[PDB]
Design a protein around this ligand. Structure first.
Ligand code: CR9
Ligand code: CA
Ligand code: CL
Length: 223
């Protein structure tokens, strides 16, 4: 997160860290046994780390659970990043409490101007690499489709939306990939891609989760 602030320990209880010996992507807990992340964060040997704040210190509240299976969306296109969503099933259910909680899936899509919370342990520099120990937060609005398509002509599909600041300075970045974009208590986006981080007129692009609720529910119900 570039230009964001320290969230405060456990204030984002649905945030998870996907770990393979180091933090590589974020994700969102949607029930006690499933996490939603981005398809491009897929890899084998994933350990999901819940209740985290400092990812380099065991401070208490952490639950480390291995992924039993990862389900990348069948129509995921790694060249356009269209359908960039993945579901991860945990080997055992997590114990939910006030520090580890699931976030709700939306019943409708959000409108331009909605203010959302984006969080993660991704890079904090737009020019260079500085990865934080604790969770960073950024409040950012969903942009209109016209401004998004004007920024990324020919690359935005109906399963994506832009959120951020066209002036640059505040944005999600590499490492935040797979994590949550929550608006009015509902998970509306997944950090997916963007050109650089916090650059002027190059906002972040997020997977539009409201277009995948029936898919998430049918897939969870059959696995
Ligand atoms: C291929 C996976 C393997 C595990 C590590 C993440 C990597 O994926 C990535 C590699 C390099 C950059 C990104 C990335 N940059 C990003 C920048 C932005 C933004 N400008 N708001 C964003 F929204 C998502 C991004 N994701 C990214 O998601
Ligand atoms: Ca920790
Ligand atoms: Cl276009």
């Amino acid at each position: 997160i570039v230009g964001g602030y320290t969230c405060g320990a456990n204030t984002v209880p649905y945030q998870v860290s996907l770990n393979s010996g180091y933090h590589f992507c974020g994700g969102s807990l949607i029930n006690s046994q499933w996490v939603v992340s981005a398809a491009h964060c897929y890899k084998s040997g994933i350990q999901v780390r819940l209740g985290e704040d400092n990812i380099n210190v065991v401070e208490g509240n952490e639950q480390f659970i291995s992924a039993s299976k990862s389900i990348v969306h069948p129509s995921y296109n790694s060249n356009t990043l269209n359908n960039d969503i993945m579901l991860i099933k945990l080997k055992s259910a997590a114990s939910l409490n006030s520090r580890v909680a699931s976030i709700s899936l939306p019943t409708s899509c959000a409108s331009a101007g909605t203010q959302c919370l984006i969080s993660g342990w991704g890079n904090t520099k737009s020019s260079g690499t500085s990865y934080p120990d604790v969770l960073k937060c950024l409040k950012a609005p969903i942009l209109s489709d016209s401004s998004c398509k004007s920024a990324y002509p020919g690359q935005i599909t109906s399963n994506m939306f832009c959120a951020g600041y066209l002036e640059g300075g505040k944005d999600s970045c590499q490492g935040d990939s797979g994590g949550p974009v929550v608006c009015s208590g509902k998970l509306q986006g997944i950090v997916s891609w963007g050109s650089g981080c916090a650059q002027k007129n190059k906002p972040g692009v997020y997977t539009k989760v409201c277009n995948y609720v029936s898919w998430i529910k049918q897939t969870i119900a059959s696995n």
